[PDB]
Each structure stands twice: as C-alpha cells, then as structure tokens.
C-alpha cells in the first residue's frame, strides 16, 4: 500500500514496514515508533558503507538502506541539443522557445536556494549545530529572490505540482525539468543541475531505508549533501514548505518568508510566542533582524600583622615599624606582636 | 492728522509690549511650555521684539512727532540697536524655520540631536551676528535731524546678511515642508480612493499667511534701502514702509506663539 501523505500519516497511526527517506525516520526514533532491529554482518558487508553512515543515528542502525536517489536535470533532446549549465541562462532560453518542476514540494526547490550557499544545521566538528540555522544567509536570500523573479517573469506556474509537471513533460510541452530516479520508469537525456552565480547546486541526497543516468545521479549527489537524520527535520521542511507557499504565490516578500521559516524552525518557542513573533514580523519587516535575534536569544532560555595585649584589666587580640607605631597608639588609647603589663 | 498718527503708533507700541510681556510670562511661568527645545527660539524672538518696542519704536515715534531728532549724540547707538534687533529677529525666524524643517523631515534624529545646548548655541550665534553686523560698522564709522542715508556698500552688505539669505533659507525650508506634506496627503488620498483638496489648501494658506506677510513687511524696506543709496524717494514713504518692518515684530508672536499651547497658557494665566 502507498497512502497519500505517508510521512504525515505514519506518526499519528504508529504499517509493519515503511519505505521512505531516512530524514523522517530520525523523528520516528525520537518518540519510539521504529523497532530497533538487530542487523547482521552478512547484510552490512553486501551493502555500501556510506549508506550505513547516512542511515546511522546516535551510533545505532535503524533500518536497512535500499537505494540512493538525487535530483537531476532531465531534458528532451528533441527541444534543445545541449542543456544549460548556468541558472542565469535559463530565463533566456525559455523566452526563445515560448524549465518547470514541482513548486509545491520544497525538496525540488531547495537545491536552487542552497546553490548560492544556503545551508541549515551546519555539520561542523562531526556534529550538527541545531542553534546555527543559516537559512537567512545571503545565499538563500539570492536563491529565493531568483526563484520568485522567475515565477513573476511567466516562466513557472505558481500552482503546478509533480503531477502537472510530469503530464507536461511526457506530452513534450516543457523543455526540461528537475526529477530523480523515480521519474525514469514513467518517462531524452539527464544531466547535473545548472550552477547559480558560479557555485554548484547542492541538492539533498535521499537514501531510502526500510550507466549515464546513474552517473549523473551520483554526480548530483556528491556535489550535494546527505539530509540530516535529526528529529527537527520534520519541522524544518515544513517551515521551508510554508516559505515556498508564501514565496511562490506572492503572499509576502523574501525577507518575510525567511523570517517565518526561522520562527517555525525554533521548536522551543510556544504557540503564543510563535504567533506573537509572526505578528511582529508581519507589521514591521524593517526590524526583522532584531526580532529574529531576540527569538534566538529566548530559544536558549526555554530550552529543556596582629597585636596581643595581656594587661591586668584589658586582655585579648586585635588587628614593620609603620604597623608597630599604630599598634602602640591603639594600646595607649585603650589604657605576631605581643604586649604585656 | 499728526495726532492720529501718534495715537496709532502709541497703540501699536502698547500692543507689541503687551504681547511680548504675555509671551514671556507664559514661558517663564509654566514648565510644560519650556520643556520643548524649539520654544527656546520663540522666546528669543519675543525678547528681540520687546527690544524693538522699547529701544527702537518709541524713540522714532517721538522723533516723528516732534518733527526732528532732539536726542543729540544718540542717533548712532539708536541705529545700532535698531539693526541689531532687526537682524536678531530675522535670524530667529530663520532658525525657527530650520528647526521645524529638521523636526518634520527627520523627527527621530531631531529628538536626539536638537538638544538644549544646540538651541543655545544657535541663539548665541544669531545674537552675536546681529551685534557684529550692527555695532562694529557703526562705532567704526563704516555706515557713513538724523536723516543721513547709509552708504552703498554697507547698506548692500547689511541687507544681504540680514534679510536675503534668511529669506532664501525660509523659502527652501517651507518649500520642502510643503512638498513633504503634499506627498503624505496625496498618499492618504490615494489609499482612500482605493479603499472606497482641503488639507493642502490649509497648509498652503498657513504658509502664505506666514511668508507673504513677512515679505510684504520686510522686503520693500530693504529694496528701498538698496535703491536709495545708488540714487528718488521721499523719507515719508520710507518711514511708512519701515514701520511695517517693526509692526512685523508684533505680528510674529501672533503666528508663531498663538498655537493651542500658547492659547491654553493665556487662558489659564489671565
């Protein structure tokens, strides 16, 4: 079986075996939905090690990898002989004929955003930095503004999805699209994603767990990065998704979309505080930087000589000539250095 | 006809003195009217006007009534005080306009940069310029019945330093203010018509009542002061037109010190 929104139906229900990208399985392991099956050396030896490293989480094996999948630029030889190598050249070629992919799912558009250097949960020192969310950097800004400009220039529809893009590509309407290995069975040539501002596109590599085309897929994968296996991913994508829904449809600007994404990423912020920050960002984008700074600050808050006298009447102790004269004056006014009488 | 002119001049002097005294009292008595920095200029103008009604207008009035200048060895200091007060009043108006422009264009920077020290420094510079342009040339015999006209070079220099430069400054200030007001009013009007003139009319009427009045008061006096030295015109018309320059001293507080705050102060004081 393959119910719609399987990634969203599995949590509320938890099927015996689930086939889906590993980025979700991490979250399932946070609450205890996936059973810790004991693997064997025979199955580990016959499979690649990088897949195990990708599906690895907290030093324990969750499931057995199945296959590696990455997005690639699928173009029809009947329309153009050579595929474009730079994103800046796509808007031109288009207007010479008249690109179209899934704008709903954020996974297809994330490569364009991360092409200019956009990143999230930086993998430094061998570990992911949850607090370091750089989705508002200049790279993601440039990517998202280029995306919304292409959407406004009558190049890609704001409501198209995977189904419409597939129906248009199979019919020979669109010149090229961005699809992974799952689209080869239904569908020409395939190549790597074009570069943006000189930097290469960094698409996410989806390793599923329980030839020239393969070459292009592996090249797109190695030029990108593997998705983090942290539980926060389930939220991150959602946030990004909203941004797309808020960016492609033209509901708000790029800064507002990125601010909403950053706010939604932070899980520690309560619903009331989340709505408050959202409203503050809506009615005043000029100070969005300070708002995000304060939100990040609040995130870490809700995170789970001596004198001795022996006189006949006055006896005791109290507290080198400079001190000796002072002690003598004190003794005179009262009527280790020790003084007796 | 002389008695009527004397009565009119006396009434004008008394009205000027009363207005200046009321303004000074409303200022120094209450504290809510002195908190604002801009008011430091308003009083600085009123004080100037007061001097005009004390050491300028009465002497010339009694001289015109008598028909000559009885105060021997006093015309020099009289002209000195007259020029000082005129330049001081004009530069006070100029700095007030500049302050209002700075407050309307950039109020956030205005509230942080326009400190009492700045207003005091500006009032100083103004009075120091008025004193330098007035006494230094008169005491050194540079301006050369007291009916002698001023010299060409000194007349031109004083008219330029006292009137024309402040005139251009106030012109540009009020023009920029009117443009900002038009921009905002038309934005509001566009929003209204998209949801579903009288404001610009009032703004222009106020700007007129201010600038056109100031002009009709002072400009012709300086025009004659610049023309006659190079001469053509009788002294009677010159006096009739310079009396407007002094009446402007009394008309000033009626426009600059007659807003809601001053109205409430005068109502609660008397």
């Amino acid at each position: 079986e393959h119910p719609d929104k399987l990634e969203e139906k599995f949590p509320q229900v938890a099927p015996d075996i689930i086939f889906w990208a590993h980025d979700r399985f991490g979250g399932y392991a946070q609450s205890g939905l996936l059973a810790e099956i004991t693997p064997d050396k025979a199955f580990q030896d016959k499979l690649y090690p990088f897949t195990w490293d990708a599906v690895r989480y907290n030093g324990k094996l969750i499931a057995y990898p199945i296959a590696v999948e990455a997005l690639s630029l699928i173009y029809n030889k009947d329309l153009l002989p050579n595929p474009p190598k730079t994103w800046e050249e796509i808007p031109a070629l288009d207007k010479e004929l008249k690109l179209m992919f899934n704008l709903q799912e954020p996974y297809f558009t994330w490569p364009l955003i991360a092409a200019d250097g956009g990143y999230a949960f930086k993998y430094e020192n061998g570990k992911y930095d949850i607090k370091d969310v750089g989705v508002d950097n200049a790279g993601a800004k440039a990517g998202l503004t280029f995306l919304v400009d292409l959407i406004k220039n009558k190049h890609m529809n704001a409501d198209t999805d995977y189904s419409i893009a597939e129906a248009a590509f199979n019919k020979g309407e669109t010149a090229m699209t961005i699809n992974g290995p799952w689209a080869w069975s239904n569908i020409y040539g395939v190549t790597v994603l074009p570069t943006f501002k000189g930097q290469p596109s960094k698409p996410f590599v989806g390793v599923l767990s329980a030839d020239p085309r393969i070459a292009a897929t592996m090249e797109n994968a190695q030029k990108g990065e593997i998705m983090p296996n942290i539980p926060q991913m389930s939220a991150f994508w959602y946030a990004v998704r909203t941004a797309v829904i808020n960016a492609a449809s033209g509901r708000q600007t790029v800064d507002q979309a990125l601010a909403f994404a950053q706010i939604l990423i932070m899980p520690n912020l309560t619903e009331e505080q989340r709505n408050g920050f959202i409203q503050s960002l809506k009615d005043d984008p000029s100070v969005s930087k300070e708002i995000l700074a304060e939100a990040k600050k609040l995130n870490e808050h809700q995170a789970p000589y001596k004198l001795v006298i022996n006189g006949k009447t006055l006896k005791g102790e109290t507290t080198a000539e400079t001190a000796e004269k002072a002690f003598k004056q004190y003794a005179n006014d009262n009527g280790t250095f020790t003084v007796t009488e | 006809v002389r008695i009527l002119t004397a009565c009119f001049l006396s009434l004008l002097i008394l009205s000027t003195l009363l207005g200046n005294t009321l303004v000074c009292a409303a200022v120094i008595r209450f504290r809510h009217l002195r908190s604002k920095v801009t008011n430091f200029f308003v009083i600085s103008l009123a004080v100037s006007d007061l001097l005009v009604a004390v050491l300028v207008m009465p002497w010339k009035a009694v001289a015109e009534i008598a028909g000559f200048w009885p105060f021997g060895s006093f015309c020099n200091i009289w002209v000195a005080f007259d020029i000082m007060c005129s330049t001081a009043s004009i530069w006070n108006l100029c700095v007030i306009s500049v302050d209002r422009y700075w407050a309307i264009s950039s109020p956030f920077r205005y509230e942080r940069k326009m400190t009492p020290k700045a207003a005091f420094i500006l009032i100083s510079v103004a009075w120091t310029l008025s004193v330098l342009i007035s006494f230094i040339p008169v005491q050194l015999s540079w301006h050369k019945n007291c009916d002698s006209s001023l010299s060409r070079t000194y007349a031109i220099s004083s008219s330029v330093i006292s009137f024309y430069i402040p005139v251009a400054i106030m012109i540009v200030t009020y023009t920029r203010i009117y443009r900002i007001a038009q921009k905002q009013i038309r934005r509001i009007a566009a929003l209204e018509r998209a949801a579903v003139f009288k404001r610009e009319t009032k703004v222009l009427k106020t700007l007129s009542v201010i600038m056109g009045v100031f002009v009709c008061c002072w400009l012709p006096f300086f025009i004659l002061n610049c023309i006659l030295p190079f001469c053509c015109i009788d002294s009677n018309t010159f006096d009739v037109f310079v009396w407007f320059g002094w009446a402007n001293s009394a008309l000033n507080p009626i426009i600059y010190a007659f807003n809601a705050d001053f109205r409430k102060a005068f109502s609660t004081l008397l």
Partner: nanobody
Amino acid sequence: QVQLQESGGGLVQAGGSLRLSCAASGSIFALNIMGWYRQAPGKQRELVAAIHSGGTTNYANSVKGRFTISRDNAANTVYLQMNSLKPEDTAVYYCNVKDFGAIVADRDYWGQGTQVTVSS
C-alpha cells in the same frame, strides 16, 4: 478634539506576548507621529516606541527587537506588539500623538495610558 482610546492591557506571565491597541478619533494632520511611552510608579516616563506617518519606526535601546509598533494607514489606529515581556515591563503605557498641524509648533494628544503587569 482628538480622543485616544486604548485597550489590550492586562496581566500576563513573564515571557508571554501582548498586543496593545489605541484608536485615535478626530482630525489629525497628515504629518503626525504616533508613539508609546511607559511610566512606572516612582520612575519617570520614558519612550518605548514611535512611528511616523511616513512609515519609519523608532525603538529604544532597551526594548529594541522585543517590541514592535505599527499603524493602520487608513484608520490611524496604532498597535504595539510586545514579546518576551519581563517583570520590569510592568507600567502604565501611554499612547502619544504628536500632530504638526501648525508648522510652527506641535500638539500632543494623550489617552491616559493603560496598566500592564508582568508576573514572575
């Protein structure tokens, strides 16, 4: 006359959010500044936020980022969103309207302020 009616004040837990509102009824010149000040018992009244008709906003160095000020261009109703409220934020918040009708002066309209309390 210009009447400023405030609302939204109340008791809130530390770290929560609150949206104060103030509606100004009356003829106001196009060039006007709407702001929020705060006064504490014993202390003096200090500026919290301000916004000019042109859209420019200004905040104090102590509340920058936590508080946001906005205004309805069509109704002259001013809203103040406060987030991450701290105990020291308890005070009477007064809405102030500075009107530049008379270019030679400015008139200040107040709304008597509203109480705000933060619990610890």
